[PDB]
Design a protein around this nucleic acid. Structure first.
Lengths: 117, 108, 189, 100
RNA sequence: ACCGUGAGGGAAAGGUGAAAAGAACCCCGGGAGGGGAGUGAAAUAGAGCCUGAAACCGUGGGCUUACAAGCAGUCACGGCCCCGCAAGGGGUUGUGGCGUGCCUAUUGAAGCAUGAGCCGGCGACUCACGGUCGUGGGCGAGCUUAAGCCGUUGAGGCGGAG
RNA sequence: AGGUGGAGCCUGGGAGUGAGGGCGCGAGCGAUAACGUCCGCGUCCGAGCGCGGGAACAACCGAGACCGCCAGCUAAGGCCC
RNA sequence: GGGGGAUGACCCCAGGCGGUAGGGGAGCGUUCCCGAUGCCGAUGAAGGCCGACCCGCGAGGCGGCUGGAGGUAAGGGAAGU
């Protein structure tokens, strides 16, 4: 009934370590805060995990404005007019357009403005 | 190219370190006067580990002069765990951090 | 049923309701178990040492903290306590029961008394070539009252007796034979 | 060759470059299959029209493969004595943009 | 060994190889130690010389660094560098974007409350006899002491006070 | 009566804390003084009731965090930078 | 929980799922005893060193380099985990 756990623990650590890129001076191999720093980073990522998709909701937000206004108006106008829509409703991709295909964008831009006034 | 060395070398790894960090990657003969007429200990030593170096080559690793030190380094190891005044109660030992001494000698 | 009689070309014996039956794995092992059990050994770690020396666990209000365990080689913590009651007396009924149904498993092989006579471990090389295979692999000696002489020695020893030859016995995977007097243990059954 | 319809989720702006697509384990199985995908973003060869003008025709793409979670880890942790770990999910079966 | 006047305490430290065949000779050098040759299956197996990990000190290389904040970092986008799982990823980060470490005890904690400098190994709900419910199952009257006998393996089987 | 829907009751094994505060309200004390304490009715936090807001701020307004980075409507709260 | 499950599994929707003491269920590697008609390995036991297949996971497998001799158990048992 010997338990020389050995070889085992050591491993684990390696484990984490890996979890251990080459982050900040130390932890680097910090078989502790090493481990730690982790936990941290983690959850972080997480909250980041769901985060992002937001940072986007906005990103487009501007690149959007960049145009939405360009022509001559804001995203409480557009928007309103847009939803006046009926067989066509989207936002994301919209942007990355106005920039990709000017005409395209430019377009709706109209059909829009209108829908509105 | 060939190389010189020697462990169980009593001395300030560190100190040593400056040693080369000079004559470092440079013409043989050349630095061969750096350490000849530089200062701080190690030198002496340092010099030495350049002669059995220049030697070894030409002799068994072969084109003289055209040589130099593509690279040079030193490492510490073995310590010398040394005992001193018992905290006037508990022991306080230092360590003459032994000293390795490698160093290249390749031909131009 | 298919109570095959040895000597092969000779007769055939009946299967005794007993063996017949179904099976009972649970008890199965169990029988087992209550085997190794009453049959292992024991051990532990020093009583003297592991609580052997004096000890000046040190005052305190100094820079420390404190003849017991938790600083090296010494102590234990709850080790081999030889005083480790090892037995496990299954139970009669229990036991017997096992072997039974147990054997039952065996059935799934008839040793003519007449054999209780053959006199050389090369007469086994014989009554061997009689009926070999892999199950023989198993094998499993056993006469009926007083073992199958020489029959006892070879590269598969083991000579129970129409009395004394249980699961521990062959029960394991295994495959064997019993001299009538053997099925004299059945009576034990 | 560049259109932008929208599936059980926009996931759009394509034409031919098969676009890793959200699950759909009922029509999919169809290996290199064909199926309709309502439009609403008619952008082809510098000519556009309502995504409501569209909502009439559309396209279709061949049910290509079944991407297997493109790695992605989720260290679920906090100082608050709560840890745990689960790896990516979101795959998806791939399929080219059959344009028309 | 070692601290203790004493009674007493009371450590650490094992491993080359098949066997020495344990490194004649030549080299720089006062030497140790380093360069060749030779043993050799291998000596980065080489004399405290099997495996010989981490921490920690070096030598080169990629990337990166002087109007910049936080251990962390992780999400976005960009340039350099390599594509033995190539039209996808590696590594490093310039920016910006959201961010108070980690453990015990705490009404409540980033903590300026304590715990820890760093790494590796030891190190903490166990065993026995009772009793107690639950469950796996053998007979419903169910069940066995101690012992007697049998015992490569050593094979259990009889014992009926309770 | 019961639209509900999923709590309820008894028998039995295993438990933990056995000292909390914060807010609104109705009372006690208190200089109607205290992030004071003391009882009550609801909530609140519980080392995660983690996220939004109020700059920052357990905690008060809204919210119930199984998981899905380049979807969509709103809450409270906001929209000159 | 419920509608039929063939052993899987598949379909609906109800229905949540944040959680420390603490309660119930399920799994993972660690050194050993089986070798329940089990044995791999000098063209490497094992540990080590490094990785963009398998799993929610704790681990697996598997391939490249190292190193001198072991030990693995398809399954149940045990414990100085």
């Amino acid at each position: 009934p010997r338990a020389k756990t050995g070889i085992v623990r050591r491993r684990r650590h390696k484990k984490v370590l890996k979890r251990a890129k080459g982050f900040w001076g130390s932890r680097s191999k910090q078989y502790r805060n090493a481990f730690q720093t982790l936990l941290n980073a983690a959850t972080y990522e997480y909250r980041d995990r769901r985060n992002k998709k937001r940072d986007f909701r906005r990103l487009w937000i501007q690149r959007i404005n960049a145009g939405a206004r360009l022509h001559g108006m804001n995203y409480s106008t557009f928007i309103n007019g847009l939803k006046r829509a009926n067989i066509d409703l989207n936002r994301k991709v919209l942007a990355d357009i106005a920039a990709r295909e000017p005409e395209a964008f430019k377009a709706l831009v109209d059909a829009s403005r209108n829908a509105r006034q | 190219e060939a190389k010189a060395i020697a462990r169980y070398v009593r001395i300030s790894p560190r100190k040593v370190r400056l040693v080369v960090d000079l004559i470092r990657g440079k013409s043989l003969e050349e630095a061969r006067n750096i350490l000849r007429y530089t200062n701080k200990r190690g030198a002496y030593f340092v010099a030495k580990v350049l002669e059995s170096a220049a030697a070894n080559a030409v002799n068994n690793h072969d084109l003289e002069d055209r040589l130099y030190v593509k690279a040079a380094y030193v490492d510490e190891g073995p310590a010398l765990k040394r005992v001193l005044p018992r905290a006037r109660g508990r022991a306080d030992i230092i360590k003459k951090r032994t000293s390795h001494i490698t160093v290249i000698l390749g031909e131009k | 049923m298919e109570a095959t009689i040895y000597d092969n070309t000779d007769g055939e014996v009946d299967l005794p309701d007993v063996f017949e039956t179904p099976v009972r794995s649970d008890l199965i092992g169990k029988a087992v178990r209550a085997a190794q059990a009453n049959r292992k050994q024991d051990y532990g770690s020093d009583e003297y040492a592991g609580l052997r020396t004096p000890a000046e666990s040190f005052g305190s209000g100094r820079g420390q903290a404190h003849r017991v365990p938790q600083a090296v080689k010494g102590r234990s913590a709850h080790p081999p306590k030889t005083e480790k009651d090892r037995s496990l007396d299954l139970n009669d009924k229990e036991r017997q029961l096992a072997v039974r149904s147990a054997l039952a498993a065996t059935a799934d092989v008839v040793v003519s008394d007449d054999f209780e006579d053959l006199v050389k471990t090369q007469e086994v090389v014989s009554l061997l070539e009689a009926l070999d295979v892999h199950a023989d692999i198993d094998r499993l000696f056993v006469t009926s009252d007083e073992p199958s002489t020489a029959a006892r020695n070879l590269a598969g020893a083991d000579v129970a007796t129409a009395s004394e030859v249980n699961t521990e016995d062959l029960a394991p995977g295994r495959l064997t034979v019993f001299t009538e007097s053997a099925l004299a243990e059945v009576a034990e059954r | 060759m560049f259109a932008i319809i929208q599936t059980g989720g926009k996931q759009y702006r394509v034409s031919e470059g098969d676009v890793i697509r959200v699950e759909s384990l009922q029509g999919e199985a169809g290996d290199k299959v064909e199926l309709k995908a309502l439009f609403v973003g008619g952008e082809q060869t510098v000519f556009g029209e309502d995504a409501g003008k569209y909502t009439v025709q559309a396209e279709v793409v061949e049910h290509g493969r079944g991407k297997k979670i493109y790695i992605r880890k989720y260290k679920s942790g906090v100082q608050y004595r709560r840890r745990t770990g689960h790896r990516q999910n979101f795959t998806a079966i791939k399929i080219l943009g059959i344009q028309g």
